[PDB]
Amino acid sequence: TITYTSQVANARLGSFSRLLLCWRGSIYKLLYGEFLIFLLCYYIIRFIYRLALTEEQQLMFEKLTLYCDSYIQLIPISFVLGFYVTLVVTRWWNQYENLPWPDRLMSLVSGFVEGKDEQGRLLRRTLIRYANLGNVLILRSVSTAVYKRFPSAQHLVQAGFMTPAEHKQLEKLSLPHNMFWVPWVWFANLSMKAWLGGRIRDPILLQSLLNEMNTLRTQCGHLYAYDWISIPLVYTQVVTVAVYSFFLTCLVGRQFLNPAKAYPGHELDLVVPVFTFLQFFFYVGWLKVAEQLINPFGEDDDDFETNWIVDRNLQVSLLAVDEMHQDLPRMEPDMYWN
Amino acid sequence: TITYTSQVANARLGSFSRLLLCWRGSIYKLLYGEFLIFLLCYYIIRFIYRLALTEEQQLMFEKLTLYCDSYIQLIPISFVLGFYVTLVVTRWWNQYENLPWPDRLMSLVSGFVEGKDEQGRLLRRTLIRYANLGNVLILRSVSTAVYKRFPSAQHLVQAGFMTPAEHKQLEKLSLPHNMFWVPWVWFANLSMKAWLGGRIRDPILLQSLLNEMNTLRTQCGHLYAYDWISIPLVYTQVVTVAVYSFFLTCLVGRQFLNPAKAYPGHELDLVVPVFTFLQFFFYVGWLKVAEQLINPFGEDDDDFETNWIVDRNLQVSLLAVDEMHQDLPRMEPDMYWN
Amino acid sequence: TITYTSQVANARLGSFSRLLLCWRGSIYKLLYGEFLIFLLCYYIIRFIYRLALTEEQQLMFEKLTLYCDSYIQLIPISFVLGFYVTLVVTRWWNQYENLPWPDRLMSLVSGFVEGKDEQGRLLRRTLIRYANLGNVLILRSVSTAVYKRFPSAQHLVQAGFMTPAEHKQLEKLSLPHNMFWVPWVWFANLSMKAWLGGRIRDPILLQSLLNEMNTLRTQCGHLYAYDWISIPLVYTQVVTVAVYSFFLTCLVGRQFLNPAKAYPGHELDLVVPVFTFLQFFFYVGWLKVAEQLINPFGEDDDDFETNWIVDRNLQVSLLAVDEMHQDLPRMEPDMYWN
Amino acid sequence: TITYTSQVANARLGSFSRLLLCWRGSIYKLLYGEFLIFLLCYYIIRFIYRLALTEEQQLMFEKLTLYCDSYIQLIPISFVLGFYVTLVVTRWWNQYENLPWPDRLMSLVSGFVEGKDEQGRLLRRTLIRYANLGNVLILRSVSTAVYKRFPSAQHLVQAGFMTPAEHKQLEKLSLPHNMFWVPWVWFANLSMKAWLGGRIRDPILLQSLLNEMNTLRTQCGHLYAYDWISIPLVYTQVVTVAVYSFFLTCLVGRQFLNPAKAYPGHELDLVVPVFTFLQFFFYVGWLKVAEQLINPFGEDDDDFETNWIVDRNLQVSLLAVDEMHQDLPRMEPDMYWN
């Protein structure tokens, strides 16, 4: 993701005008290639019309240009594209809200699971590891970035998410469907064992651990759902057709006809169709933003930093439950004490 | 459902343009039959006008064409169709969010319900079976796909969702209304029996089981609600009338009048009304998407894979609570251990 | 309600086109009377203009017709009516989501409240009855259908919702405001008595019962809120004025002027203003849908089946907690067992 | 609030047309004064133009009228006003959903807090009083109606919400900020004392009491938030400017020019600009509805009955926990018993 929230903390002169000079995560980066293809086609058509067609061919071309410019408005481009973009943006933020953070769980696993010995350490680390393993198994499914980082389960084994025992146990349980759900069943059985073994003192704390873990399940499930149930392919096809039809008809309708013939609206020849390029910038940029956001777990500049999230989550989880377990700052009176 | 989320992970040149070449779940599949009927009617009208009407009849037809094309905009097609489609898409995603997944419950039933003997196995399998049975009873009500798979309760008996004892007990409890609610009462009474019999060690875990099961009830109830309370038939009728009236008036208003008479906007005869066909594609495609999504539990390409969900849920539930109960990977220090 | 969800399970040719031939719950049923009044007024005005006015009177009428048709667009009918309808539809579905279903509670009352003797039966039936009584007291307030079924509390007594003791106890507690809240206080005091008397074994189950009951309270409260706080009367008045002003000005603006005088847009006389009737169908139908949905607890075809819900809820609640208490199907291994 | 939900239970002929004849809470009441000022200004301008200006002055005035009527559409009145009104209506209903009702809490305080003696009565009444006191302290902050009823804390003391001891304890704790939060800390410390003193038998019930009370806190906090964080003053200023600029330009643009000069659109002089008055009714009425709803805790006809809510809440709370504690109807078999 490209963050600029600090830069726009206060309304000031120009404001978003300083943001126009940004390349990474910008509309220019998303639009230049399609724009250059449109620019080439437009000028090829202009050159064909001006230096290839005969007089009667030029008259026919001019009729077709006035016809196309007249029936540009039949295309409900605003209608279709507005609907599509609102759908994509809603889904994008819903996808971000369902990224699982183990912080609520790691605080409970650090507090409730007793023992400063080797076995307590191992139990706490393995519980949070199950939480982080569940998240990374769902993320490698839903994220092309994470999958490229972890092409197989053995890659998770060499990265600390999975032990060899865990790996072979998952291979034994292999089912045709996705097996991201397994660490939750592992977490429940391990936490029950811990409670029965006296490492968890009361089953109310055990209830509290399982609720936090199940919250993460529900978030992972939402991620699974957004990956599986795409925006209906009909809508993507329709909005794609709307944008392409609009600019394909602009390739002819927005030519500068011979100003000698004094057609209404064609009196002045400016060579560069500035307003047509502005409409391309707005409409195609708008579509290209939707193309970027439709799967926010790709490798786009403004896609979520899913690998960063995975690494941070595992580091913070292991710190919080191993080194921070019953390690507290000395409790001393504050500055406002008396 | 047709999933393409991986294909659109990154914004790239064309992007959704590769999706235009997809047939399954496509706008072409939804539109071709209605489009071919519209195409036939339009050209029949053109041929009648050009080779059947006399001169004065042609003048009257031309007057009617200019009148119809002038009063095409009285039809609030964008207004009505936008409202309808937003309603349908909201309901569609709400319907997906209320598909019950037993994962939260199966982890609790695997952890809390004690015993590696025959009776423990049987108790855990029957509890998750009650959850899966409740889901399949509601789904066969709300889903034509599931109902075709399970025309009667005996079909559920031969598929492992229902035992003969369960089947005869449901026949004894028969009420005029839908009896999807029964497995929840079975689950509560069995879980209470389990707790009293010592298979559940503490009533806090019993509370936790009943909360998860009741969550699934609330999801099933939402599914029942969306199946029963249709989008008001007035709205479907109105949007249907709007789209059909628009294209029925286009059948005459969008004819290419005699270019000899030099009517304004009718100077050029292109035979093929490209913009009228594009408007058909946008508006009728938009309606046909709503027709597909209005009941997402049908047998449409882009409808939910409800049978797949049912089979997966039962397989994963039974695995998680029977074979995964107190079967844990050997707890060994991770790669980051020290 | 009129349900057609099964009929529209798959996108097919015509699709909603088979729904056009439905009378119950249809736009035709909602529109015919107002439409027939509009049809009579329009033709009366046409006949007055054509067979009553003198030549100079006809010229003045024609001026007024062209003026009215020109300033039809000043009326923000789409603006106002779109806002109103989105408000009504949101509130309509929110009202449905807050219909209380005792299923979550009846499963807990069947499981937790112990005793197969007379006193256990009586206690379980009275607890669910308090839940159903609270719902029917709020529903008879918010629903004209339920109130017509139960004009007084004695009608609830003869229908099994209320005992004579309960009736006289409510008469003793009479307050100026609505007393739907009383069964919740009864439920809490009875459930506490049950727990102290040993019919509920652990206060965690007692907590679980009170949470479910309080959920139903919060739903009933929402119903109370939607009944009391109407859509602001200003909005209903404004949208009513917008629709009526639009069609009152159409009564004159949409007349077919003398085609002899060759007014622009009045060249062709079709007698029947098809597009004006289509606009009536869209706009007035749209308003009439809002009039139907604004109170979904009336006796409209597409209003909620509140009496059906009340009867079903009481039947299912009493079955679930009396006949289904500790009556379980014989637990036998499933088909997938081994 | 003005409630008419019963009146609109069924769609019928006219429907909202009977609501047009309502004065209290009506658009007429909100619009008449501004409308009468607009009506006076319009006719003053007409009289100045017709009986004060010379011929060349009349020509200049007519030029300015045609200019103004031409550039009326530059004002994005629909854009701005639609955005503003959707914001206001969302906030209005969110404000209503966060009015705290003690019903969930009063049922728990009636059930859990034991003792039919003086001390039990006093403890239960004081707990619900803390809940009602917290609500009335936040409401007198956010509601001008409640503040006028209770100008000082001593007014709360004479109305039964606050005891003299409670009053002096709040005066001792005085902080620069609002002290609505204090009764929640009182409720928690009193409920803990009650539990330690054996009036609450189990800490699970104590947990249940504190959760309900904290829910009311979160609702009161939302009310505090909506009172403090106004709709941004920029939006109110902009929508105010949009509506006023539109009608100030209508004062000249919508004059009926001399019909002798036969200006396009000015052929017919009707003296009364019916469509301009209709646009005033729609747009200014729409703004005035937003002005009414922007603070729903004022003394407007359609503002919430906050004083009624406060009185009802205290009466019902005290009844439910004092007179209804362990007072149950005799449990007798229902009509459906056997």
Added chain:
Amino acid sequence: TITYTSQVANARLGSFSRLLLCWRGSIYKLLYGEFLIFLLCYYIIRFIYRLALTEEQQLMFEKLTLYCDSYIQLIPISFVLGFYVTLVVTRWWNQYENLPWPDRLMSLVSGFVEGKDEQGRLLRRTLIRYANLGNVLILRSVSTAVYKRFPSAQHLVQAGFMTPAEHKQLEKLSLPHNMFWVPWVWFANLSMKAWLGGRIRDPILLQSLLNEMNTLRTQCGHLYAYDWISIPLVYTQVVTVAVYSFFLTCLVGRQFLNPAKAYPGHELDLVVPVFTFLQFFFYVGWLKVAEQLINPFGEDDDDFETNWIVDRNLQVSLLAVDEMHQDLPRMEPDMYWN
């Protein structure tokens, strides 16, 4: 923030018209500098056109003015700006809802954590301090105002949020990422220690403390998310380009051409383009409101009073748990007692 909720409690004549005379938090303050730059450029262009260009240059300029004014509508300024502003306003209110208030937690810490001695005081103050420290660590990240108040952790130490021991313990745990999460792990380990040490009597109260604290975590996480995941930079760039392109083309298209040449729409020269300035006020004001709200934790007039919130929260938390612990008003019968 600028609050005026009390001022608009009732709909009255003018209403928001008294708000037009407000400078702090006003549209005038947000618009004047950009407006003055636009005003200078417009009049410079007018003076160049009127007193610098030759006759043929004036004809060319007039052609370009009529071209620009004709193709002003190609810019989807309403489309783009409406989408952007709805996104910003949603995010703004979501950001406010996720400001953490310790009131729910401080009531539980005051009630549950026992002891009127030094150690009880110290334990209660340190628990709420951990809650307030977590909030201030996230706020100094997401808020430029708080960061300017607390440039380093030592500034938090001198302000009472952090003890020197806490400061050195955080320095020892330093990770590359943000360490706002640490006080939650501290809170969980301290609350567990308190429970084991008998200061918390039952683990149900311990569960209740950890749930409240974890709620605050989830709110802080949302704040972190809104700070990190900006509105996509593509949208800000596009809306910026739309507004600037619209007014840059207005600089030429909205000039008053020579009225001698009697161009259509240019008959009257008013020197001041009132409607162009009104459109600037609406559109640029609308953008500038979005610029103000996009980061509501800056130092803008209408930005959240985050420093005030932080100070209030710490003062109220410390009061509630130290001075208000087991300090209750004398429980005496209320005015309605009997």
